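Second opinion, please. Please look over this fold, written as C-alpha cells:

===
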Amino acid sequence: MSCRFYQHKFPEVEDVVMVNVRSIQEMGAYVSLLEYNNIEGMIHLSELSRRRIRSINKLIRIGRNECVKVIRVDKEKGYIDLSKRRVSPEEAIKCEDKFTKSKTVYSILRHVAEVLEYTKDEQLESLFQRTAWVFDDKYKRPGYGAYDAFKHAVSDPSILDSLDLNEDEREVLINNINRRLTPQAVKIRADIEVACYGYEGIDAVKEALRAGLNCSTENMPIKINLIAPPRYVMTTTTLERTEGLSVLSQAMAVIKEKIEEKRGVFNVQMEPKVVTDTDETELARQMERLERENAEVDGD
C-alpha cells in the first residue's frame, strides 16, 4: 500500500517533483519520490554537486525534502534515477501546486472513504485510481486536471457520466466535493429594532420588515421574526460571507427608511453575523431557542 496519488504511473526520464530523502550514501543519495504519486528514488552525487563534494548534507539528509528531476528509470523492476542540475523555481513551483491540488483531492477521497468505511488501504487507493486519478488521466493532467474537474463537477456532471459508482459513494463523494469546493448559500443573521411611535406607524413597521425581506435576492430566502418588542431577528441563506450580510445591512437601512419615514426608529442588536461550515458542530451544544422566554406572567 505505497502508491496513492496515482496508483503508481510516471513517464520515463521527465519527472520533476518534490521528494523526501531516504538513504544517503557517499557514492549516491537514495531519496523518496513521494510514497504515493511515484515511489523512492536514487540520485547521483557525481552529478548532484559539481566542484568538490562531501556528502550533499545541505541538500537531502533524513528530514530534508527537495525538488529534483528523474533522469532514467529501470523497467527491470521499477527504479528511478535522480539529478538536480540546478533546477529552476518555475519547476519547483509547478510541483508544489501539483501536490497541493493532488493532496486536497487525495484527502477529499480519504475522508469520503473514511465515512463509507474504506480503511482497507487498497480500498482508498482503489477509489483514488477509480476517480481522482481516472479524471487526471482523462485530460492528461498530473493531478491538476482531476482537481479542476472536481471543482466543475458540482455544476457540470456531464463529465461524471462514466463514473460507475454506488448511490452511497456517488452522493457522498459529490456531497464532499461541494462541501469542500462549492457550498450552498451561507446562514446569516443580524438583529434590528424597528419602532413607529404612533397608532398610524404600524403601517411602516409591517412595510419595513417586508422591505428587508424583499431586498434579498433570488435563491437567497431571508427570515425576519420578532422575539421581543424593541428587538428583532433577520436571518437568510446567501452565499458569500460579506455579500450575504451586505443584503442584511441593505435591509437594515431600507427598514430604517421604511420606519423613520413614518416617524419611527431603527436599532441593530448584533450586526450581521455569517455562519461557517464548522459552526455546525457547536450548534448542537447550544440548542434552546424558544425556551429563552422570560415573561412568566400567565394570569394576573
Remarks:
- The first strand starts at residue 16 and ends at 25.
- Residues 185-300 form a domain with the Alpha-Beta Plaits fold (CATH 3.30.70.1130).
- The helical segments are 89-115, 122-138, 144-152, 167-180, 202-214, 241-260, 279-286.
